[PDB]
Enzyme design. Structure first.
Site, mmCIF file in Angstrom:
data_model
loop_
_atom_site.group_PDB
_atom_site.id
_atom_site.type_symbol
_atom_site.label_atom_id
_atom_site.label_comp_id
_atom_site.label_asym_id
_atom_site.label_seq_id
_atom_site.Cartn_x
_atom_site.Cartn_y
_atom_site.Cartn_z
ATOM 1 N N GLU A 1 3.677 -10.860 88.721
ATOM 2 C CA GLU A 1 4.032 -9.337 87.803
ATOM 3 C C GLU A 1 3.136 -8.856 87.069
ATOM 4 O O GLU A 1 2.205 -9.507 85.953
ATOM 5 C CB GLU A 1 5.629 -9.964 86.998
ATOM 6 C CG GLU A 1 5.915 -8.726 86.257
ATOM 7 C CD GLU A 1 6.523 -8.875 85.463
ATOM 8 O OE1 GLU A 1 7.195 -9.608 84.764
ATOM 9 O OE2 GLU A 1 7.902 -8.029 85.344
ATOM 10 N N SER B 1 -4.395 -31.661 61.625
ATOM 11 C CA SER B 1 -6.106 -31.380 61.355
ATOM 12 C C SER B 1 -6.049 -31.633 62.561
ATOM 13 O O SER B 1 -7.215 -31.833 63.287
ATOM 14 C CB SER B 1 -6.617 -30.863 60.030
ATOM 15 O OG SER B 1 -7.164 -33.137 60.158
ATOM 16 N N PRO C 1 -10.922 -26.713 59.746
ATOM 17 C CA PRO C 1 -11.052 -28.500 58.395
ATOM 18 C C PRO C 1 -10.111 -29.454 58.867
ATOM 19 O O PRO C 1 -9.090 -28.842 58.622
ATOM 20 C CB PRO C 1 -10.689 -26.833 57.554
ATOM 21 C CG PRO C 1 -11.007 -25.718 58.315
ATOM 22 C CD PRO C 1 -11.155 -25.724 59.507
ATOM 23 N N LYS D 1 10.880 -3.307 89.587
ATOM 24 C CA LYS D 1 12.022 -3.750 88.864
ATOM 25 C C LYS D 1 13.173 -3.252 88.116
ATOM 26 O O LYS D 1 13.524 -2.213 87.370
ATOM 27 C CB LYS D 1 10.999 -4.528 87.744
ATOM 28 C CG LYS D 1 11.667 -5.947 87.196
ATOM 29 C CD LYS D 1 10.688 -6.299 86.424
ATOM 30 C CE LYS D 1 11.132 -7.295 85.690
ATOM 31 N NZ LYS D 1 10.587 -8.621 84.615
ATOM 32 N N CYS E 1 10.545 -11.068 88.478
ATOM 33 C CA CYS E 1 10.790 -12.367 86.871
ATOM 34 C C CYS E 1 11.697 -12.394 86.758
ATOM 35 O O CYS E 1 13.157 -13.403 87.481
ATOM 36 C CB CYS E 1 10.034 -11.409 86.560
ATOM 37 S SG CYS E 1 9.219 -13.368 85.045
ATOM 38 N N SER F 1 -8.614 -32.806 57.585
ATOM 39 C CA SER F 1 -8.693 -32.801 56.528
ATOM 40 C C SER F 1 -8.167 -34.395 56.305
ATOM 41 O O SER F 1 -8.636 -34.964 55.279
ATOM 42 C CB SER F 1 -7.137 -32.888 56.595
ATOM 43 O OG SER F 1 -6.097 -33.547 57.252
HETATM 44 N N1 LIG Z 1 -8.963 -32.452 52.610
HETATM 45 C C1 LIG Z 1 -9.530 -31.208 53.484
HETATM 46 N N2 LIG Z 1 -10.778 -31.032 54.274
HETATM 47 C C2 LIG Z 1 -10.635 -30.180 55.216
HETATM 48 N N3 LIG Z 1 -9.176 -29.401 55.455
HETATM 49 C C3 LIG Z 1 -7.941 -29.176 54.398
HETATM 50 C C4 LIG Z 1 -7.943 -30.190 54.210
HETATM 51 N N4 LIG Z 1 -7.041 -30.323 52.986
HETATM 52 C C5 LIG Z 1 -5.865 -29.210 53.609
HETATM 53 N N5 LIG Z 1 -6.572 -28.663 54.556
HETATM 54 C C6 LIG Z 1 -6.142 -27.710 55.189
HETATM 55 O O1 LIG Z 1 -5.008 -27.148 54.781
HETATM 56 C C7 LIG Z 1 -4.138 -27.040 55.799
HETATM 57 C C8 LIG Z 1 -3.358 -28.129 54.615
HETATM 58 O O2 LIG Z 1 -2.641 -28.449 53.686
HETATM 59 P P1 LIG Z 1 -2.693 -29.916 52.149
HETATM 60 O O3 LIG Z 1 -1.848 -29.840 53.091
HETATM 61 O O4 LIG Z 1 -2.756 -29.253 51.439
HETATM 62 O O5 LIG Z 1 -3.661 -30.233 53.156
HETATM 63 C C9 LIG Z 1 -4.087 -27.217 56.800
HETATM 64 O O6 LIG Z 1 -4.473 -26.232 57.001
HETATM 65 C C10 LIG Z 1 -5.450 -28.293 56.749
HETATM 66 O O7 LIG Z 1 -6.591 -27.936 58.025
HETATM 67 MG MG LIG Z 2 -0.779 -33.603 59.219
#
Ligand SMILES: Nc1ncnc2c1ncn2[C@@H]1O[C@H](COP(=O)(O)O)[C@@H](O)[C@H]1O
Ligand SMILES: [Mg+2]
Ligand SMILES: Nc1ncnc2c1ncn2[C@@H]1O[C@H](COP(=O)(O)OP(=O)(O)OC[C@H]2O[C@@H]([n+]3cccc(C(=O)O)c3)[C@H](O)[C@@H]2O)[C@@H](O)[C@H]1O
Ligand SMILES: Nc1ncnc2c1ncn2[C@@H]1O[C@H](COP(=O)(O)OP(=O)(O)OC[C@H]2O[C@@H]([n+]3cccc(C(=O)O)c3)[C@H](O)[C@@H]2O)[C@@H](O)[C@H]1O
Ligand SMILES: Nc1ncnc2c1ncn2[C@@H]1O[C@H](COP(=O)(O)O)[C@@H](O)[C@H]1O
Ligand SMILES: [Cl-]
Ligand SMILES: [Cl-]
Ligand SMILES: [Cl-]
Ligand SMILES: [Cl-]
Ligand SMILES: [Cl-]
Ligand SMILES: [Cl-]
Ligand SMILES: [Cl-]
Ligand SMILES: [Cl-]
Ligand SMILES: [Cl-]
Ligand SMILES: [Cl-]
Ligand SMILES: [Mg+2]
Lengths: 696, 696
Positions: free
Chosen positions: A43, A360, A353, A112, A173, A355
């Site tokens: 589509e 993550s 990031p 359509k 569709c 964690s």
């Molecule tokens: N120690 C850490 N290192 C890297 N990223 C973190 C960390 N703690 C939290 N985050 C990021 O923050 C969010 C989660 O928050 P929190 O639950 O307070 O850990 C997610 O987007 C994680 O990627």
């Molecule tokens: Mg988790």
């Protein structure tokens, strides 16, 4: 008798006319090499389905036509009927159309008649449904097309093609599942082949309903059914999962990929039309309820769909449709998504990031999966993918084989410990990165935090304390949030400068890790690491995330995930007083992710406000809870929800997966300044409770 | 909220008003005891669906109404909505209708809008479809009904009921699978419950399509679906197999029996209407393609379908539909058929010419199965069945427990050996009878045969010889046939006098043993034992018969069947010359039962004449046979078929099982004086062959 038809999935890109053209050409060239005499595309494939408000722009219309002209003058399109999609304006009204051409002539333009206006779809914003059923009008061609095609006008509307040997009809569709679908009357009229061009996006677990439908339809009415669909990301938060198919008389003959890194995938099948004719005789060779309705207009086409090939051409045998497990679905879609995002953003890689927690981690797994797919693809001889990897990493001679190798070049993970982070979480993140191959960064935010709180003290003369150091509820929260936000500040700094610090050009997309459940309750810090550039797991359920991560252990061989799964889900942002341990997110929220999911689905899927929801659960949880109790759960849910909704307005864009997303830009339009006491609704709830509490 | 509805299967009998009434009453009384507030019955249940040309008779109309009046004045029908079926003439036009009443008022009469005119169905012979869709007219009631009901007129046409709490709509039998079914618009309009009254007869293996349909419909459109169907024999060669069901939102909640010896079977279910409402929200809580069609007229009904019962009433849980194996289907249907035939014919039992071959054996097994069912039923507390057995055998105190015991009283098997019968076949028949319990008769026909051929000689002066004694092809055949026909003469003599010879009142139904495959090729002797009173296996395939008999070994514990299966299928009617052995029926026919079945199905199911069939097989058997070869097979088939068709006109009536029956009275209308050279058709075939034989 025997015919050979082709359908396809294309990775089209909004307004990317050059690329869109080349993809369409390639599919046609492929179909012709396979002996197809008809080719079906997705589509709006000429402009890409997801152009949104660009459809208001006349340029869109124009270029589409310039693309159509290029198709028409191309020697590849010779001796094959081609059904492409573009917008088309007829008498000052914009329609979503199929343009069917053969040997430098337009046969029919078919608009359509039912438009998608639910969820992420809003076609009525730009298009009008064709309302003059079983009728056509003369469409006047652009001089651009006239000169090329030597036709003044073509039929525009609800019509079918009749060739020397068959009768082909169109179902666009969602017309497939709209009450009183074209395929019913087309069947009745004797249409033997029905083409359906789709642009449907992925939705976790609902792949079978598409297949079932086409199946049932062909079973019930007889006939060949062709379905084509866009596949990939066309420039936004959706992933189209083209399960292009070819079905006949209730059986499937070709199954297209749901997720792959192919820009062009073509299905063919060689079918005997007489199987249709004899299968329809098998049902009702008689007459029907005596309908006497206006019959379908017929475009005569001087062409034979079957041409002499029979003497060698093997008939396609029936096949069984293979589905992906939900975990396989998760490991593939967001993955292929992230690949198109990276390659079309022209960005140098990702910054994650990490964690040491589940989400993550899942996000990390999606990247690793991506790498694997790329390796798989390259091994498979996929030149486009090879070209792209080579362009992304800048190394002409490069050839990804080991996924850990590619990963390293493409993913930067970053662990940002505060004063209160444990050695355990730091370790787990270090280990997971080691295992997938990423460039890992581990740092401590506390120097930046001390500095911020210094600025605060310096100017207010006051020092906020953590709850455990005698601080107020407000102080505690603020402090926690500062760390959260400093992490975000740092994440972007590395996104922007980490490659630089490693002697290398370019910058990184920041990836987020909010899950659909916490996004809904707003259980996140506005402008912490919850806001990144793109979030691939933003629409996935927490339970599914755990499920997906446990599945990754054995499929990807990543043992580091076990500890991550086993570890308590706690946010180490505040110091712990003596005698107590960390509070888990589920206690923090005041409800389990399980029950949170139920609210989510009752809310968006079942369309329940607080009163409705109170009534549903009252029965669902009749054994477990008492009326006063469910009232409280519901009330607690709606209040926290409403109080936090504003967080949603600015939240990172997320891969779409669950049909219960709270996403505000497209899928879930809502206020953001609510009366958060829900006085009226909550009063209704109380009255019901009071009424029940009068029973003995 | 919570409602309780009932549907049912009734063993109705054509024109049997007294019984039909009592059955309807019983179901209503049962539904009410189970708490139902709506009861659904089968199509035309008041008169019985199979009245055929009696529908032309005004008396039919009249009594139906007298039956309706009886229902209306009956205290059982109080506080339950009752949907019965009868013919009704409105403005001099006869319609197949639903009459819905509540507390001595008619709410709505709803006429059928699509009529069955295929196979055994020919409703257009007697009824007119209602053509004024979404419209009603005032029907004027009979004074008989007026006086009782105190209403001058009622709505007649396409309408729905609206009650204080719900909206119920009607879909009659085949309207369920007719293009543009009522259930689509009813759904759109917000109809939450849809009742379908059926009269569909058994068809081997096709039970699932009914279930699938209802399932898919509820899945696709949401809603509760109710289906009721006649069950048993209503006075002809059909068996209705009421798989009455209750479905909601794609799941099944109640599954009715396909074959049972119950005159009345009622299904109930307790469902929450809010599940519908929330399941529909789950799909499309929006708007549709913008249809703006004439909406359904609404009959206001002052009644609440849900009434206070909630506090105790358990919600019905979903179930899985259990199907019968094809062999179980065979062992049950014809079996239950034979039971109604025996009980309603008021005959003293059956007389089965048992040859020691497979088909006669299968027939025997069906009777034994019948007996088992009766025993099962009696054990189960079924008073009707107990009453009937007691009436059939004349013993007030009788109580069947051992099936072999009942069998003995009900079945008389008869082995009629000729001069050339082997000791083996005689034995096998003796053994099988011993095992099932029947009264077995073994005799030799030869004295009667000698006598007939004596009369012939005496008057013509000539003695015919068997082929092996130098006789001509004609003489041989004639002789064989005489024996065949003498067997028939003897069979009827015993039917008429065997009970007499055992000191007991009454007479027997003669059972036949022709299979559908030989019936089609006419490979039988006109007026031999192929013509009896009823034939329960007349519509079953030879392969299925073997399959069924092998299944009987372990289910019924009858070892005698093994030898019967293992024995060569030969007709010992002619003496065997030295050096040769008996010719098998398959060599006699000039084609295997396998390939015969293919012709059968290609002919009746796929609607192919000789040319079409030649083309189909040409591809099907492309490896195995050459073009000249398939031409011969087809030609041989059509000629033998056409030459023998006249045998079909007088053939015993048969239980209907395969949708490829050659039965001439109802299902397969055909000439019987054909040009048996098929000059034109066969010439087309030759031309095609000649064309192909020009290839190198
Ligand atoms: N120690 C850490 N290192 C890297 N990223 C973190 C960390 N703690 C939290 N985050 C990021 O923050 C969010 C989660 O928050 P929190 O639950 O307070 O850990 C997610 O987007 C994680 O990627
Ligand atoms: Mg988790
Ligand atoms: N109706 C409305 N319309 C527009 N804006 C509105 C508003 N109501 C409040 N606001 C404003 O929105 C802002 C909200 O942001 P902010 O003040 O920072 O605070 P906020 O984001 O509301 O609070 C953060 C939440 O995250 C949780 N948390 C803590 C620690 C770690 C984690 C984690 O998992 O990562 C989560 C914590 O329990 C807390 O409930 C406020 O300035 C408020 O004034
Ligand atoms: N077009 C037409 N319309 C109406 N009638 C037509 C007719 N053509 C012939 N007829 C007549 O129909 C009559 C046919 O009956 P009839 O003359 O007795 O002979 P018929 O039934 O045609 O022959 C019996 C067949 O049964 C087979 N058979 C033999 C032995 C045992 C078994 C077994 O399995 O039990 C079967 C045998 O191979 C033979 O082919 C003839 O009088 C013929 O003149
Ligand atoms: N020896 C036999 N005893 C009783 N019935 C027979 C016998 N032979 C044939 N029949 C009947 O004749 C038909 C089969 O014909 P045939 O194939 O010649 O055995 C069936 O209806 C049988 O019930
Ligand atoms: Cl122009
Ligand atoms: Cl036309
Ligand atoms: Cl740069
Ligand atoms: Cl976690
Ligand atoms: Cl977790
Ligand atoms: Cl009258
Ligand atoms: Cl109305
Ligand atoms: Cl008598
Ligand atoms: Cl046999
Ligand atoms: Cl056999
Ligand atoms: Mg046999």
């Amino acid at each position: 008798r025997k015919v050979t038809v082709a359908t396809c999935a294309l990775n089209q890109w909004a307004l990317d006319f050059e690329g869109n053209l080349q993809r369409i050409l390639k599919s046609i060239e492929i179909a012709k090499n396979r002996g197809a005499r008809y080719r079906l595309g997705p589509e709006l494939e000429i402009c890409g389905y997801g152009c949104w408000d660009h459809y208001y722009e006349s340029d869109t219309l124009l270029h589409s036509f310039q693309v159509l002209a290029a198709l028409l003058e191309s020697p590849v399109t010779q001796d094959i009927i081609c059904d492409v999609g573009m917008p088309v304006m007829h008498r000052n009204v914009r329609y979503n159309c199929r343009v069917i051409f053969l040997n430098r002539k337009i046969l029919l333009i078919r608009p359509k008649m039912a438009l998608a206006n639910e969820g992420n779809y809003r076609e009525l914003r730009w298009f009008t449904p064709w309302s003059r059923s079983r009728h056509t009008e003369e469409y006047f061609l652009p001089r651009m097309i006239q000169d090329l095609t030597k036709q003044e006008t073509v039929p525009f509307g609800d019509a079918v093609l009749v060739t020397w040997d068959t009768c082909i009809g169109s179902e666009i569709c969602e017309e497939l599942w709209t009450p009183h679908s074209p395929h019913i009357d087309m069947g009745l009229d004797g249409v033997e082949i029905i083409t359906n061009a789709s642009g449907s996006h992925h939705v976790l677990r609902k792949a079978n309903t598409r297949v079932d439908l086409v199946t049932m339809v062909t079973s019930k009415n007889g006939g060949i059914y062709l379905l084509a669909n866009q596949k990939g990301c066309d420039g936004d938060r959706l992933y189209y999962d083209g399960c292009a198919m070819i079905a006949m008389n209730g059986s499937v003959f070709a199954q297209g990929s749901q997720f792959s890194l192919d820009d062009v995938e073509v299905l063919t099948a060689t079918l005997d039309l007489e199987d249709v004719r004899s299968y329809r005789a098998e049902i009702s060779s008689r007459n029907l309820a005596a309908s006497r309705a206006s019959p379908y207009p017929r475009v005569k086409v001087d062409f034979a769909l079957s041409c002499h090939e029979d003497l060698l051409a093997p008939i396609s045998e029936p096949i069984e449709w293979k589905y992906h497990s939900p975990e396989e679905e998760i490991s593939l879609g967001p993955a292929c998504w992230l690949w198109d995002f990276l390659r079309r953003s022209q960005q140098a890689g990702f910054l994650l990031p990490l964690s040491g927690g589940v989400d993550s981690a899942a996000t990390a797994c999606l990247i690793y999966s991506m790498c694997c797919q790329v390796c798989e693809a390259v091994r498979s001889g996929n030149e486009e993918v090879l070209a792209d990897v080579r362009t992304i990493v800048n190394q002409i001679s490069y050839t990804p084989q080991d996924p850990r190798d590619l990963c390293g070049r493409i993913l930067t993970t970053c662990y940002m410990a505060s004063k209160n982070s444990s050695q355990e979480t730091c370790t787990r993140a270090r280990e997971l990165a080691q295992q997938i191959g990423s460039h890992h960064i581990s740092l401590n935010i506390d120097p930046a935090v001390k500095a911020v709180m210094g600025i605060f003290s310096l100017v207010t003369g006051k020092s906020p304390l953590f709850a455990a150091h005698g601080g107020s509820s407000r102080e505690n929260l603020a402090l926690q949030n500062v760390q959260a936000r400093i992490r975000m500040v740092l994440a972007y700094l590395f996104a922007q400068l980490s490659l630089w610090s490693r002697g290398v050009h370019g910058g990184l997309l920041v990836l987020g890790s909010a899950n659909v459940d916490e996004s809904l309750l707003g259980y996140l810090t506005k402008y912490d690491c919850s806001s990144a550039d793109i979030n691939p797991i933003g629409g996935i359920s927490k339970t599914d995330l755990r499920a997906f991560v446990q599945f990754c252990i054995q499929r990807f061989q990543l043992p580091a995930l076990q500890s991550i799964l086993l570890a308590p889900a706690t946010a180490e942002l505040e110091p712990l007083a003596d005698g107590q341990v960390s509070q888990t997110d589920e206690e923090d929220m005041g409800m389990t992710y399980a029950e949170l999911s139920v609210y989510g689905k009752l809310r968006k899927v079942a369309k329940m406000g607080p009163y409705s929801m109170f009534c549903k659960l009252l029965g669902m949880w009749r054994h477990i809870c008492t009326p006063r109790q469910v009232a409280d759960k519901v009330k607690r849910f709606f209040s926290k929800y409403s109080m936090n909704r504003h967080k949603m307005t600015t939240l990172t864009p997320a891969y779409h997966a669950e049909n219960y997303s709270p996403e505000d830009n497209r899928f879930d339009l809502r206020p953001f300044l609510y009366n958060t006491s829900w006085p009226w609704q909550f009063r209704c709830i109380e009255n019901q409770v009071l009424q029940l509490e009068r029973a003995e």
